[PDB]
Amino acid sequence: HVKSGLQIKKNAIIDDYKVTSQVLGLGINGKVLQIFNKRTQEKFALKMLQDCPKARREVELHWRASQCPHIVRIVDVYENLYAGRKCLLIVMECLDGGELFSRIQDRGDQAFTEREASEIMKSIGEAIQYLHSINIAHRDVKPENLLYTSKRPNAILKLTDFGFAKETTGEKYDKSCDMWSLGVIMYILLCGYPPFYSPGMKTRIRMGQYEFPNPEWSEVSEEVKMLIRNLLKTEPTQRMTITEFMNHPWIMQSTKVPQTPLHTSRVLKEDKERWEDVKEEMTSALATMR
Numbered sequence: 001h002v003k004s005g006l007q008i009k010k011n012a013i014i015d016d017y018k019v020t021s022q023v024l025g026l027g028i029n030g031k032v033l034q035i036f037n038k039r040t041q042e043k044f045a046l047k048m049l050q051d052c053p054k055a056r057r058e059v060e061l062h063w064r065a066s067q068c069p070h071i072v073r074i075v076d077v078y079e080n081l082y083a084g085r086k087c088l089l090i091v092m093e094c095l096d097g098g099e100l101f102s103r104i105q106d107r108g109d110q111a112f113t114e115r116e117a118s119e120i121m122k123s124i125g126e127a128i129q130y131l132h133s134i135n136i137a138h139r140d141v142k143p144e145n146l147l148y149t150s151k152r153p154n155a156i157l158k159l160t161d162f163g164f165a166k167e168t169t170g171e172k173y174d175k176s177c178d179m180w181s182l183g184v185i186m187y188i189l190l191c192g193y194p195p196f197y198s199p200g201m202k203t204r205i206r207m208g209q210y211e212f213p214n215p216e217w218s219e220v221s222e223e224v225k226m227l228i229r230n231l232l233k234t235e236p237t238q239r240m241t242i243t244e245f246m247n248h249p250w251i252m253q254s255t256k257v258p259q260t261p262l263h264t265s266r267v268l269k270e271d272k273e274r275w276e277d278v279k280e281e282m283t284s285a286l287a288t289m290r
């Protein structure tokens with residue numbers, strides 16, 4: 001099938017949208033502000049990039065990805081002058097449900113189940129699949145870039161941030177780090193801490209120890225552990241691919257996976273002072289796996 005290419009608008013964005021000062025996110029590449037379409041009054045998000053080759057690649061690759069139901073949608077892209085600099089202003093659908101793990105952490109029940117984790121991974125998996133099959137690797141799949149459409153329990157999860165995406169034609173192992181990200185996310189979903197070796201807090205993984213500590217992992221099947229191990233495999237030549245992953249019975253039959261109660265929500269609350277550290281370890285790790 002054939003799709004339309006990206007048409008960058010040159011008219012001033014203020015002809016079309018009201019632009020507020022409320023920041024809805026921060027990025028080592030620019031900011032995200034709140035805005036409203038003038039004629040319809042619909043709310044939208046605005047990502048601002050200083051125009052450059054990298055910004056252009058971000059917008060292009062994200063444009064290709066945009067129609068995926070589990071990737072955030074680009075409504076329009078503008079090339080404008082702002083504050084004395086030439087910018088790409090990107091209008092996206094509003095995603096005000098919060099980040100993936102904040103939600104889980106906030107569950108007053110502390111009632112999160114293996115099945116729920118499966119369905120979430122199928123969602124993320126679908127984004128990665130859409131991308132990998134058009135030879136794009138995202139390369140920044142991590143907690144802060146996964147957001148929900150609304151606060152509704154039934155909100156859709158969306159992958160954001162194409163700042164590190166690249167075309168992978170002829171360098172297939174670029175896709176691998178997206179798979180490791182899936183492994184890491186799945187592991188945190190299942191227990192509340194990442195599979196990282198790393199005062200007034202429990203140590204969840206001892207340095208060098210077996211990866212699935214009994215307190216939190218005792219009721220998780222060996223099949224699931226094997227799935228994680230395949231995703232986390234050290235060697236990119238041996239790591240699971242997105243096709244193998246989306247063909248796995250635990251993902252393919254997500255809705256019929258056991259509702260094993262998990263420690264995830266309680267651990268996220270217990271360890272909340274360490275979350276920034278978690279995100280920072282993952283970011284540093286990503287920089288070396290890309």
Ligand SMILES: CN1CC2(CNC(=O)c3c2[nH]c2c3CCc3cnc(-c4ccccc4F)cc3-2)C1
Nearest residue numbers: 024025026027045072093094095096144160161
């Ligand atoms: C670290 N966070 C993720 C962050 C960085 N890079 C992005 O592309 C990015 C980021 N946040 C967003 C986006 C684009 C889609 C997007 C859409 N909507 C929101 C958003 C809208 C209303 C209220 C709160 C929100 F987070 C926020 C984002 C800021």
Ligand SMILES: [Mg+2]
Nearest residue numbers: 066067068071
């Ligand atoms: Mg989409």
